[PDB]
Amino acid sequence: SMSVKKPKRDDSKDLALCSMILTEMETHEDAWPFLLPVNLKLVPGYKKVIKKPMDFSTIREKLSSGQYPNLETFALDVRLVFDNCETFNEDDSDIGRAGHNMRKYFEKKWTDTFK
Numbered sequence: 047s048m049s050v051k052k053p054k055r056d057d058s059k060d061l062a063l064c065s066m067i068l069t070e071m072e073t074h075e076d077a078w079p080f081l082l083p084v085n086l087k088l089v090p091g092y093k094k095v096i097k098k099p100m101d102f103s104t105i106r107e108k109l110s111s112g113q114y115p116n117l118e119t120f121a122l123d124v125r126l127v128f129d130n131c132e133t134f135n136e137d138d139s140d141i142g143r144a145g146h147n148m149r150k151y152f153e154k155k156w157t158d159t160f161k
Contacts, residue, residue: 076147
């Protein structure tokens, strides 16, 4: 509350560390469905159904330009990529499996770097 604060957690390395995670997600062999925005002219139903499209290149641009206020807003966009994937793709598809794999990969790196 006013003039009452928990001890200050060092957040000075968060930007660098989220960049490193994002690099590791970019270079994963199952990243290909997620590297670029889904083409809303060429994929029927995407535009109407997926209200907030997100992809790794869009996260990279937001990261590089100071549009994440804190590490939690960064994680929310990463998770959004996988939540969108599950909304649109059957579990038993190459893309559906890719999304589950990448979400696992992310959540481990997140826990190991920050928890």
